[PDB]
Amino acid sequence: YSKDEEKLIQSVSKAVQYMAKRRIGALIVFEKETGLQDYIETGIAMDSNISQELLICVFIPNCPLHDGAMIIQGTKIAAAASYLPLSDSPKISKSLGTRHRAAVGISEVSDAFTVIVSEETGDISVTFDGKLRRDISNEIFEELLAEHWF
Amino acid sequence: SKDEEKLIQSVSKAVQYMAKRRIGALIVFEKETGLQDYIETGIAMDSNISQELLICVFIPNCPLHDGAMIIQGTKIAAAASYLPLSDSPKISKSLGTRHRAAVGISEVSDAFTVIVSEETGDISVTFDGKLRRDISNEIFEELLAEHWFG
């Protein structure tokens, strides 16, 4: 892995851990092969470089960009506050936030890789290919982020 | 010029919103004098400009609210940049440091800087070494257009 590719992962990883401990809900979608320009246009265009600080700033509660999904295209944030499709599978708990139903939702209609931070639990969750992995450790998140991103 | 009038509206509407809520803000737009020296002081963004993103950067306690946002052309080159503070004896000493930061970058370059006072909520501007205080919103858009797009 490139030195920069690792810098990005620690940036994203450090941001997720900050939000995890403070129970800040967060929802970040990483584009893979399926084009997500339909969903990127849902929100406010950023086309911005990544840094931990930006990631945290976007999800601050009572912030204009916290409501919705941040969508990442390659090494850039394509948009924030995107509306993703919500999922209807009856196997989602219903004790689970809209963010979670959105991430499995986008997981059903594309190959995208999405990380969710539960505003109520602080657990780190991941979705891809219609499948959900819940309450992963930081080590596993960095492991999985790298595979799907790079 | 249509694209410019929407950028001016983006910047102007955000500045007024922060003004009414007494949110401190400090934004410098570069013209002729390169600031890449100061842009490297802060967090690299290279981000498109939008009303929501300007406001999110300066929400109090946001990791980027402390410092200067620097704008290059139609993009935000960096946020939370360190500008040099000025030592002129006509400065109130009755004003937050944000004011003296804009008078600082005004002395060493031709840059155009806007300030929103955290304690007062008034709108100020600096260029060519002098500070102009509590201008109206109508006047602020006129000067921004003048200095940003010639």
Author numbering:
A (entry chain A): 110 to 259
B (entry chain B): 111 to 260
Study authors write:
In the human pathogen Staphylococcus aureus, c-di-AMP is produced by the di-adenylate cyclase enzyme DacA, which is thought to form a complex and be regulated by YbbR and GlmM, two other conserved proteins.
Two key interacting residues in the dimer interface are amino acids N166 and T172. The protein crystallized in the same dimeric conformation as the DacACD protein and electron densities consistent with the formation of two disulfide bonds were observed for the DacACD-C variant, which were absent in the DacACD protein. The WT DacACD and DacACD-C variant had similar elution profiles and eluted at a retention volume as expected for a DacACD dimer. The DacACD-C variant displayed very similar activity to the WT DacACD protein, suggesting that locking the dimer through two disulfide bridges does not influence the activity of the enzyme.
